[PDB]
């Protein structure tokens, strides 16, 4: 396997994001006060912008991808046409333990929790075989496929960039929460206009998959898709946050939807509205 992707750094304030349905209930016009794992309001969320060059002037740079998994994350990419393709949540990313391999090609999602040989820089190679020959992916992410359990092979996770009307499309948000032997993944794809950085708005999230597997996941890093020509100049926009145990008051709407919330802790004003 090859090591080629490098990552830059930045910081930004996640104004108000991460509120999600804790469970499926039709609670309508209900001021619930659920306490669970959430993303703190106005928290400093990083802005990883993984960048790749075709390969020349190696200029001694060390690799430096690495990411922790304290509680849950808030991977909230913004990129338009699918390049972010999946995540490799694990604890050692070696032949010793288990690790998820969420992979989202054009027609399926391939969650394949398994002892993998993830090397220092995984990535999906989409290579051109013939003049057209459709599109084919391969394996530089893993090289072992050791003893492990079954897959999940569901409908594609990220949608197929429905962008006909000419806008800067969905702010893809996911909240990967691991608890009590379950993997809970939520999703939401609220569209945005040209220049956005997760504006105001208390938009909620919906559960997508509740994976029954239970692991000691403590680290992760997202899989990019490099279009083979040596590969073309890739790019990405990570938005890895970090969840904290916070108490929220959720302001459910008429049609069971969530439209407003408050963290009860940012300000004494917020606390007073939290205790009513």
């Amino acid at each position: 396997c090859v090591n080629l992707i490098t990552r830059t750094q930045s910081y930004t304030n996640s104004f108000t994001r991460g509120v999600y349905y804790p469970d499926k209930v039709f609670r309508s016009s209900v001021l619930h006060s659920t306490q669970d794992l959430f993303l703190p309001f106005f928290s400093n969320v990083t802005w990883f912008h993984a960048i790749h060059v075709s390969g020349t002037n190696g200029t001694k740079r060390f690799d430096n991808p690495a990411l922790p998994f304290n509680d849950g994350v808030y991977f909230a990419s913004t990129e338009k046409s699918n390049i972010i393709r999946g995540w490799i949540f694990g604890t050692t990313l070696d032949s010793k333990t288990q690790s998820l391999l969420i992979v989202n090609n054009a027609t399926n999602v391939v969650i394949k929790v398994c002892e993998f040989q993830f090397c220092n820089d995984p990535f999906l190679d989409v290579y051109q075989k013939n003049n057209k020959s459709w599109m084919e992916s391969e394996f530089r992410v893993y090289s072992s496929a050791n003893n492990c359990t079954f897959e999940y092979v569901s409908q594609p996770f990220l949608m197929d960039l429905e962008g006909k009307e000419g806008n800067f499309k969905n702010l893809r948000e996911f909240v990967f929460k691991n608890i009590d032997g379950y993997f809970k993944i939520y999703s939401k794809h609220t569209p945005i206009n040209l220049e956005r950085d997760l504006p105001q708005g208390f938009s909620a999230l919906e559960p997508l998959v509740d994976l029954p597997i239970g692991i000691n996941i403590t680290r992760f890093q997202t899989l990019l898709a490099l279009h083979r020509s040596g590969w073309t100049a890739g790019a990405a926009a990570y938005y890895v946050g970090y969840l904290q145990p916070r108490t929220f008051l959720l302001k459910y709407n008429e049609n069971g939807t969530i439209t407003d919330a408050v963290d009860c802790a940012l300000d004494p004003l917020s606390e007073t509205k939290c205790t009513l």
Partner: antibody
Amino acid sequence: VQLVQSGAEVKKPGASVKVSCKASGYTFTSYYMHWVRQAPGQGLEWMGIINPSGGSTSNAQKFQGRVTMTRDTFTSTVYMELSSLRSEDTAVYYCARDIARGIGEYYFDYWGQGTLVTVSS
Amino acid sequence: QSALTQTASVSGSPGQSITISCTGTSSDVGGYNYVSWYQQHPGKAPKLMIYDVYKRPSGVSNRFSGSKSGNTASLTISGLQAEDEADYYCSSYTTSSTLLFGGGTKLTVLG
């Protein structure tokens, strides 16, 4: 995948030395190639990188500009050079390769062969 | 610089499991999570034994296990046989754009 360097070389103090290492068994341009030093019986030291794809020719601040490493892909060799050596180094030199395809992380293996550049009055 | 300085010499017994330490600037080890533990067999070229904190390469018999807490690193050699009298060297990428090699740990065993 075994590497090879030049033979033992000797120079008087205050002179130049030009050592060479040749790669084999893999794609020379893909992998990095480092240079290291250690006085006889003393701790190791690391020079820099000669990434064959494009001359990076890095070095530590201690040797900044003193060492001028050059690549050669056609012969699959690495050329590493000194300047103004007066009994300071007189050490054993190893051409180093790192465990990485493409952009590299400084974890060394396949430490060449080993050459004893010797300088003394 | 040579900020990473470890034990000058350590001793052990056959069967015992002695740990050698890597000490240097806490920025170098605390800031970045890269350490290396190249062995040095006397009279010939060194070689790697664990390329990351706890990631072993091929052909090391799974006898060496790494650790890290702020400015700590070790191999935890299992048996400490007679062949392990070879010198040991630590190294880690720096906060600055350079690589520092430790010097010392001339391990000794009974005999």
